[PDB]
């Protein structure tokens, strides 16, 4: 059969699995911080 | 000492800032999941009097129980910087939601697909044995479905009220170092 | 000391730079998979005040649990070179995603082909036994399918918020050597 | 079959699981305290 | 000391020069297969600063795990001859590919012919027992097919990024002998 | 039958297994570093 | 000392002079089969520099593993007579072929006739038992077929590259006796 | 049946098993080194 | 079957489960005490 109590989380917010290198994430973090400071 | 005595049983209205999923199993008290909330009221004291302690962080712990779909929370510490001083005391309090003890949610389980497959395998096995005039798959799927445990999810941004079970005297970091210098 | 006291419960917005696959099995807490993230905010402190600590690396550890499809992260250390000095302290913090504790993903398993073959062998065995009026292959395939364990994959470049469970005093390497020279 | 004694809590007040970040809850707490003080 | 402090969490882009086949079995951590790669970038440090360490060899170790088709790599040592001096330090780092931890490949198994023969023998045995109104070969073939273990092959010439989990102070051989002469 | 939860990684980025000697990878690393420095 | 420091990770192109058959069984690491190769390149060192060490013998050891059809080689010693001096040091290196670790071949087994006879005996036994409305030969043939173990053959005259896992200082025999005369 | 995951290495580069004596391999190594030095 | 001896308490006076916050109960207690003192 199925499970018991409701089998669902009521706010679906998963992570995005994109394949970017360490250096690209580093450059994105610089861009984010630079924008945020301004 | 510019700091009143927070008597046993004072409570303050707060709001949750970091949620968690309460480990609700036969062994959840030892696997705690940290939460956090932040004071947005005035500490209500027994004789209709208060003490302004707002805009401060108190860190918690959580673990749910399944019978009553609530998440039991045991406070850890406080943190306040009213002025040029710091505060870090240990609080043995707890958190109550909408009147009763512990925040309540809706218990959640995930063994839908695995249990469906196990039941299908068992039913097919039974009819296959019956109509002769698989079996070793079912035990694997049970052991795979038996490693979960129901959890109660708590959002971030719900209203609760912290309450101090045991009273204590609020003191800053410097006053703590100075008395620690005596002995 | 040109360095404020990072009180218990301060949090800072960050971004993941090295992902990982969370070992999500009955024994995952001991087989940790390192991640890493890098601070891109300002440390939020309890009384609406901050301390500019941006552009710094904090190394982590990870291990997922299957019930709540989240990846629990326990910080390891920090690293900062604001100016001509270095920083390396140990941080006992954690990481929360989108409000709740631990980053969440989608649990992943690979036993598709092996389980398909094992089930086919079992079904063929059952019907072959039934219609008489292989068997020793199935146990091998089960033991081959039983050595996996579901994993939760975490990309690199998602937004999270580190939070310091226990407060500490930020100090540089040189100030650490000098006090270590006393005793 | 079913359970025994009544299987229902008589005042249903559950929590709302909305996905908001730590900083957003922080800003909401500031808004709440600021309004309450006034 | 003409050598900066390589803080915890710095990473450098590299390229694999010697591949390996990752021993991916229930016991692979103890049977490691050496790899090697060679630095072709500039060491990225926490506050957007670097240190030219290019054209140097760092020797590794490898062992894969089957669930996530990745090859976990634990560094061994470094080797550099910038100028007229030598360098040989021990590095406790690791290697990450395309964002996540460990280089990924495609797991590979070889029990095709042996398993085919074992299954054929078992099927023939079953039908021979059934239609009466070989057996001792099958156990030999299983024990011959049970001595393999899946491996993940890693080429030589793929792009990876080494990352130093724990910081250290780079020093040459001569500076190491001189301090070793003190005690 | 099949597995349980989804049996797929959502960003397929595998390694290329080409058979080149150590010295050839070494020369490629020189080429890469020389280009990157310029 | 007219001899540079061979840093950790330097490699040199070589060529195999004595092949071997790699004992590839569950116990092969203890039954090693010696090989030998002879240096026909220039030692590549980390910062694009070399040291002419050509025309010298380095003796090895071998043992294969079945999963990856490779032959793992652990070096033993070196031998050089550049000039009027001798060299005999111990090298803890290994050998890599075509990019990856260990030379690869094609695994080879010989139980063709014995296994054929055992299977024939078993099949005849099964049908003889079945059609009634030899046996003690089969166990002997299994025990005779179970004393082999697959081997990987390596020719003599293939191209490989030795690589020194741990660095060392090259010294001649006379310089070794003189320092041994001190203590 | 067959194996599970793909049963093939994706770059086939095996060794050549030719029967030549030690001295012949030695002479080949001399030839190789002599050519390489020039 | 059923139980043995009579299965009923002879004066039914249960509690009311209404969902009111701590502060609301506090204000009600003030109202009650203030009225009682007068």
Numbering used by the authors:
A (entry chain J), D (entry chain h), F (entry chain F), H (entry chain B), I (entry chain f): 17 to 54
B (entry chain g), C (entry chain I), E (entry chain E), G (entry chain A): 195 to 327, 359 to 408
The study reports:
Here, we present the structure of an outer-membrane core complex from the iconic F-T4SS encoded by the E. coli pED208 plasmid solved by single-particle cryo-electron microscopy at 3.3 Å resolution. This 2.1 MDa structure, provides an atomic model of the TraB, TraK and TraV proteins and unveils unique stoichiometry relationships between the three proteins. Surprisingly, the complex is formed by two highly flexible concentric rings made by a total of 69 proteins chains arranged in two distinct symmetries. The components that make up this complex include the proteins TraB, TraK and TraV which are homologous to VirB10, VirB9 and VirB7 respectively and are observed throughout the multi-functional T4SS spectrum.
In the inner ring, seventeen ASUIR heterodimers made of TraBCTD and TraVNTD (labelled −8 to +8 in the clockwise direction) assemble to form the complete OMCCIR. In the ASUIR, an atomic model of the TraB C-terminal domain (CTD) and TraV N-terminal domain (NTD) could be built and refined into the electron density. The ASUIR is predominantly made up of TraBCTD which includes a total of seventeen β strands and three α helices. Six of these strands (β3, β5, β8, β14–β16) mediate the interaction with TraVNTD. The core of the structure has a β barrel that connects to two anti-parallel α helices (α1 and α2) and a third helix (α3) towards the C-terminal end. The N-terminal end of the TraV (residues 17–54) is located entirely in the inner ring which includes a single helix α1. A single ASUIR makes contact with four other neighbouring ASUs, involving two ASUs each in the clockwise and anti-clockwise direction. The ASUs +1 and −1 are contiguous to ASU-0IR and hence bury a much larger surface area of 2481 Å2 and 2435 Å2, respectively. Notably, an inter TraVNTD di-sulphide bond has been observed between residue Cys35 of chain B and Cys27 of chain D. This interchain di-sulphide bond between contiguous TraVNTD chains creates a wide mesh that spreads over the TraB proteins and extends to the periphery of the OMCCIR. The TraB α1 helix and TraV NTD residues Gly17-Ser23 define a rim-ward hydrophobic surface suggesting that this portion of the OMCC is likely embedded in the bacterial OM.
